[PDB]
Design a binder for these strands. Structure first.
Lengths: 122, 135, 67, 164
RNA sequence: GGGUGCUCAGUACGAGAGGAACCGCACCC
RNA sequence: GCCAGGAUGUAGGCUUAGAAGCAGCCAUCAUUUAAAGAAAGCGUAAUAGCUCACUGGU
């Protein structure tokens, strides 16, 4: 499960390439993150000369997880990676392009811009 | 196997030959086997530069050669010596086999003045014997 | 009302202002001629009995302003 | 004593007093220590002693009776007014329907012996024979949405001083 | 009583920047 | 205590943007009164409103 020190791929064009989880937001006791949860993380890798830099602390919403989610209709959806979107504070992506497929669960957490920019939603 | 060393050198007149020269760890020094012309064998501390084959003699007529032992009165001023006798016929009690050979500095009457390696100076009775050479 | 005793007295007296009254009287004017006249005109507004009373009041306002 | 006007019938039974009249009928119980009697044409109240608490009880009992007599003789009323754009009252049957800024209207039905009249959409009148019950229902109506401090919107008594 | 998501509403209000509140829904303790 | 009067010239004069009983400066008369200040406070931008003094009642 995604927890402190878990590495997450960044599914946006903000400049960040990978982040390392510091904590899961939502109240004392929260330890694991799944789709829709917001984490505080440190940028582990980033493209040089960009707006986001290595070592910086950012907030990011989880949009794809290997653990997945069970749905009310009996379906279960999971992905082949744990990914997140940074975010400006209003949830909009800092970059202008999203690479690779993203999970539809992001729609429930109001990450509408990312869903619209995604090449495909599964 | 600690060997018996001759510190008396009283086989006067009888020629001996340095048979061998070996180390003696119990003496931290070298010793030589001496075969005498009369059949007797004896070990002595081997002075510096003594080699297998050289002859050895002791007594008043001995040749002044390293390894030879004579009464101090029969020894040339300036010669280095060791295994110095303090009492005629009591064997050497000074510089027996460790240290630095003393040196004859002068002869006066019945005395022979000798300067030990320590700068120390002593007037021993010429009757006392000493071996020529460096230990 | 009619012109206050003050303005009547001002116009009568012949001035545009009052005073520091006890000390610097601002002007003189004739009573039995003028104070009476004013007393007459001001009468509808005076609770006076006789004109002589009507006067005492008018003359009394003239003092407050020094005339 | 309290004068019993014409048309008014007063009945006393222990500490319970019933007064009937053209405008209504009211029954009220009073403090045990007070003695109430209909002396022919007037109601008299007799306290047991002259201490203070009794003297105070005596005047309080007397007033209540006076007002009970006023209520059934001189049918009582209390007016309220609505202040606020869109705030209005209407009469739908015996029910008072209030539109006072909530998602839906508030409907109030008076109990027996009470009437509510709405002469204009921003005026409500509560009336009945019992002065107390009239006072109580009007306080309950106002309490649905009392006047707010910034603009004075809500329900207020007719002469309510509520400076914004 | 409380936790949480939401709604009320980008409404009311405010010159603007901004921006509620009272009403109400759902899972949970 | 409670009820009712507390008035007329008149917003006195002057001054002041205003200045009306009540910023300040002069005064502080007179009327009709049972009584009622050219007003003792609050109030007003100035007004208004409210009290008070005095009088009646109870």
């Amino acid at each position: 499960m995604i927890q402190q020190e878990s590495r997450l791929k960044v599914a946006d064009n903000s400049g960040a390439r990978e982040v390392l989880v510091i904590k899961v937001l939502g109240g004392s006791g929260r330890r694991y993150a799944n789709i829709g949860d917001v984490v505080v993380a440190t940028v582990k890798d980033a493209t040089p000369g960009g707006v986001v830099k290595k070592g910086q602390v950012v907030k990011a919403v989880v949009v794809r997880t290997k653990r997945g989610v069970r749905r009310p209709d009996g379906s279960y959806i999971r992905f082949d990676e744990n990914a997140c979107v940074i975010i400006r504070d209003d949830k909009s992506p800092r970059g202008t392009r999203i690479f690779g497929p993203v999970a539809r669960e992001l729609r429930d957490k109001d990450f509408m811009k990312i869903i619209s920019l995604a090449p495909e939603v599964i | 196997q600690y060997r018996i060393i001759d510190f008396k050198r009283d086989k006067d007149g009888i020629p001996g030959r340095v048979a061998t020269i070996e180390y003696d760890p119990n003496r931290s020094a070298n010793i030589a086997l001496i075969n005498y012309a009369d059949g007797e064998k004896r070990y002595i501390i081997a002075p510096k530069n003594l080699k297998v084959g050289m002859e050895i003699m002791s007594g008043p007529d001995a040749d002044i050669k390293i390894g030879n032992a004579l009464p101090l009165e029969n020894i040339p001023v300036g010669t280095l010596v060791h295994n110095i006798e303090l009492k005629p016929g009591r064997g050497g009690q000074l510089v027996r086999a460790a240290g630095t050979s003393a040196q004859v500095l002068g002869k006066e009457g019945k005395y022979v003045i000798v300067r030990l390696a320590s700068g120390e100076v002593r007037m021993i009775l010429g009757k006392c014997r000493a071996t020529v050479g460096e230990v | 009302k009619t012109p206050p005793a003050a303005v009547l007295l001002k116009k009568a007296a012949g001035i545009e202002s009052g005073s520091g009254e006890p000390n610097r009287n601002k002007v003189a004017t004739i009573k039995r001629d003028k104070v009476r006249e004013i007393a007459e005109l001001k009468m509808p507004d005076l609770n006076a009995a006789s004109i002589e009373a009507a006067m005492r009041m008018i003359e009394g306002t003239a003092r407050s302003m020094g005339i | 004593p309290i004068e019993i006007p014409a048309g008014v019938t007063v009945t006393v039974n222990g500490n319970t007093v019933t007064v009937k009249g053209p405008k209504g009928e009211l029954t009220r119980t009073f403090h045990p220590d007070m003695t109430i009697t209909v002396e022919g044409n007037v109601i008299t109240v007799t306290r047991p002693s002259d201490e203070k608490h009794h003297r105070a009880l005596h005047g309080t009992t007397r007033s209540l009776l006076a007002n009970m007599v006023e209520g059934v003789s001189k049918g009582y009323e209390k007016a309220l007014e609505l202040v606020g754009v869109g705030y209005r009252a209407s009469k739908q049957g015996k029910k008072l329907v209030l539109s006072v800024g909530y998602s839906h209207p508030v409907e109030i039905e008076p109990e027996e012996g009470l009437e509510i009249e709405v002469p204009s959409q921003t005026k409500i009148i509560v009336k009945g024979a019992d002065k107390q019950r009239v006072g109580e229902l009007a306080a309950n109506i106002r309490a649905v949405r009392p006047p707010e401090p910034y603009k004075g919107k809500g329900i207020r008594y007719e002469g309510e001083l509520v400076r914004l």
